[PDB]
C-alpha cells in the first residue's frame, strides 16, 4: 500500500512516498505545482515514471528540506526512481541506464585560502 | 553626534576655568588640551588656547561657533600644498 525512495542531491534531502492513485503530487503539504510554481525545471523531478509509463498510476506524498528548490528537484527525481525499483526490481533496466538510479555527488567545492572561491584566484599583476 | 540622551560634553575641568573666569569679571588666556569639548554659550567672548598637538592655538569664540568642538578652530595639519 506504499512505496518509498530516498532522494539526496546537494544538501537537499527528499523523502518521496509513492502511493497508488490518479497521479497527484504533494510536497511538504503544499501541492507540487504550488511549490515549484514557475520553475520550469519542474517536470524533471517526475521524469522517472516517464520511462516507466506510470505518470497517472501513482499519487505521491513528498517531503524535502535543505538545499534549494532545484536541489530538491533532483532529490525528488532520485527518490521517485528509487521507489520504483523498490516497487518492482524489473523496473531497474529502463531506469538505471537513463541515469535515474544514480546520485550525482556534484557538491559545492569548498573555498580555499588565498583564493576567492573554490578556484577563482586573486587578480595577477606582475608589478 | 554625541547621543543627546547624554548631555553636551565639556571635560568639567575646562568648564571650571570658564565660570571661575565669569564670576571674576573675565577674561584670561585659557590654555587647554580639550579639543573634544563642545563650545558652550558661556564661552562667547573668551579666547581659548587650543592645542593642535604642537602649539596652543588661540581661538576667540563668537556666538556663531557654539555648536562645535574647540578642535575645529585649531587645525592639526600644516599643509601649504605641493609645488
Amino acid at each position: 500500500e506504499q512505496y518509498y525512495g530516498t532522494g539526496r542531491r546537494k544538501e537537499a534531502v527528499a523523502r518521496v512516498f509513492l502511493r497508488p492513485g490518479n497521479g497527484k503530487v504533494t510536497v511538504n503539504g503544499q501541492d507540487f505545482n504550488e511549490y515549484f510554481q514557475g520553475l520550469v525545471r519542474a517536470v524533471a523531478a517526475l521524469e522517472p515514471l516517464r520511462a516507466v509509463d506510470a505518470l497517472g498510476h501513482f499519487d505521491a506524498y513528498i517531503t524535502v528540506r535543505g538545499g534549494g528548490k532545484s536541489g530538491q528537484i533532483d532529490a525528488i527525481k532520485l527518490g521517485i526512481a528509487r521507489a520504483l525499483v523498490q516497487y518492482n526490481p524489473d523496473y531497474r533496466a529502463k531506469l538505471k541506464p537513463l541515469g535515474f538510479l544514480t546520485r550525482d555527488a556534484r557538491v559545492v567545492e569548498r573555498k580555499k585560502y588565498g583564493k576567492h572561491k573554490a578556484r577563482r584566484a586573486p587578480q595577477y599583476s606582475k608589478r | 553626534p554625541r547621543s543627546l540622551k547624554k548631555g553636551v560634553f565639556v571635560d568639567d575641568h575646562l568648564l571650571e576655568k570658564v565660570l571661575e573666569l565669569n564670576a571674576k569679571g573675565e577674561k584670561r588666556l585659557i590654555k587647554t588640551w580639550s579639543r573634544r569639548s563642545t563650545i558652550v554659550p558661556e564661552m562667547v567672548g573668551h579666547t581659548i588656547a587650543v592645542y593642535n598637538g604642537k602649539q596652543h592655538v588661540p581661538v576667540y569664540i563668537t556666538e556663531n561657533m557654539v555648536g562645535h568642538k574647540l578642535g575645529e578652530f585649531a587645525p592639526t595639519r600644516t599643509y601649504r600644498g605641493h609645488g
Binding site: - | 563668537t62 556663531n64 561657533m65 562645535h68 578642535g71 575645529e72 578652530f73 587645525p75 605641493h82
Partner: protein, 61 residues
C-alpha cells in the same frame, strides 16, 4: 518645505558660516576637499575634480 532657490540659500549660508568662523569643514570647503572624513591620498575625485597629472620622481639609470 522651503525649496528650489530658497533651500539653496540656507545650504549656501550654512557652508558660508562654516568657512566664516574658521571651522575645519570651512577649511575643507575653502580648499575644495572632502569634509566628511574621507581619505584624499587616492580618490576624492568627485570633490577635487579631473586629475591634474604632474611629473613624478625618477628612477636611476
Amino acid at each position: 518645505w522651503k525649496l528650489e532657490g530658497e533651500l539653496r540659500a540656507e545650504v549656501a549660508a550654512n557652508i558660508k558660516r562654516l568657512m566664516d568662523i574658521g571651522c575645519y569643514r570651512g577649511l575643507r570647503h575653502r580648499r575644495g576637499l572632502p569634509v566628511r572624513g574621507q581619505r584624499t591620498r587616492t580618490n576624492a575625485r568627485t570633490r577635487k575634480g579631473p586629475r591634474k597629472t604632474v611629473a613624478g620622481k625618477k628612477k636611476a639609470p
